[PDB]
């Protein structure tokens with residue numbers, strides 16, 4: 001690979017701050033050589049600087065943790081990707097032809113209940129932040145809507161799919177998702193900054209605060225740091241750090257977390273758009289210099305995450321800006337992958 005471009009990374013972060021991120025930071029693990037940059041503040045009220053060791057909410061990177069647990073269950077003979085969801089969770093879904101594989105690749109047609117919750121950004125956050133949902137509560141909210149397409153037929157990203165994933169994990173193992181994440185992933189990879197504390201609202205240890213951008217342009221930011229994330233759970237509630245998500249995605253892509261057969265299933269790409277695919281709880285992004293990278297994005301209120309690795313896991317990058325509902329920042333932060341993998345023009 002090209003050398004990572006730290007001057008480019010620096011410019012990305014500075015641009016994100018100019019667009020409304022209080023803080024922005026990035027870590028690259030380039031085959032044993034670290035790159036780390038940060039600009040701005042973890043807490044905008046106190047002025048404390050952001051750093052690459054600050055913990056944060058990784059959002060839908062959680063779907064890749066959930067997918068690794070499910071694929072290990074496939075390896076163990078406890079789950080068949082082409083069985084119907086209702087085989088394991090009887091009566092859950094209106095159509096017994098919706099399969100596990102379809103849920104994990106967002107081809108199930110299940111409506112995303114968070115489109116209702118977050119039609120208005122700050123009121124929707126204030127509505128859910130202190131609520132505790134069961135898995136079933138969220139499935140019922142989705143099923144109030146019709147499915148959006150026939151089983152398997154269309155890619156439509158939906159958090160409901162990884163709510164189903166959490167239910168599957170808990171039913172087939174008899175354990176909570178926290179216990180499964182801990183035993184299967186956090187402990188074996190020594191992810192000392194990685195937690196699943198749902199429904200606790202506290203972020204353990206030193207962390208970036210999150211700042212939700214309101215829908216009104218120029219409006220004051222809302223501190224969104226402490227919330228249950230119960231609206232997402234196995235679709236979005238993990239806490240981690242840049243070092244730990246680099247460790248995780250490198251371990252995944254280098255073949256340490258499941259059999260070769262299940263990793264190949266995880267990387268069967270469904271088209272998202274002309275530069276992106278979705279596997280099983282895994283994204284592919286195609287970068288301008290002809291390199292594809294693999295991992296996941298996250299958005300929860302106040303936190304935008306990118307965490308991606310090369311195909312062989314030897315280079316991994318995690319970037320965080322502590323705002324959300326700010327597409328300028330979101331688009332800018334994607335450029336960290338360009339600078340880190342494609343290098344200098």
Ligand SMILES: *P(=O)([O-])[C@@H](C)NC(=O)CCCC[C@H](NC(=O)C[NH3+])C(=O)[O-]
Nearest residue numbers: 059060118121236298299300301324325
């Ligand atoms: P993942 O990270 O894809 C999953 C856990 N996150 C989402 O689906 C996004 C949730 C909504 C995020 C907020 N947007 C709005 O409220 C839009 N009105 C945001 O914080 O940007």
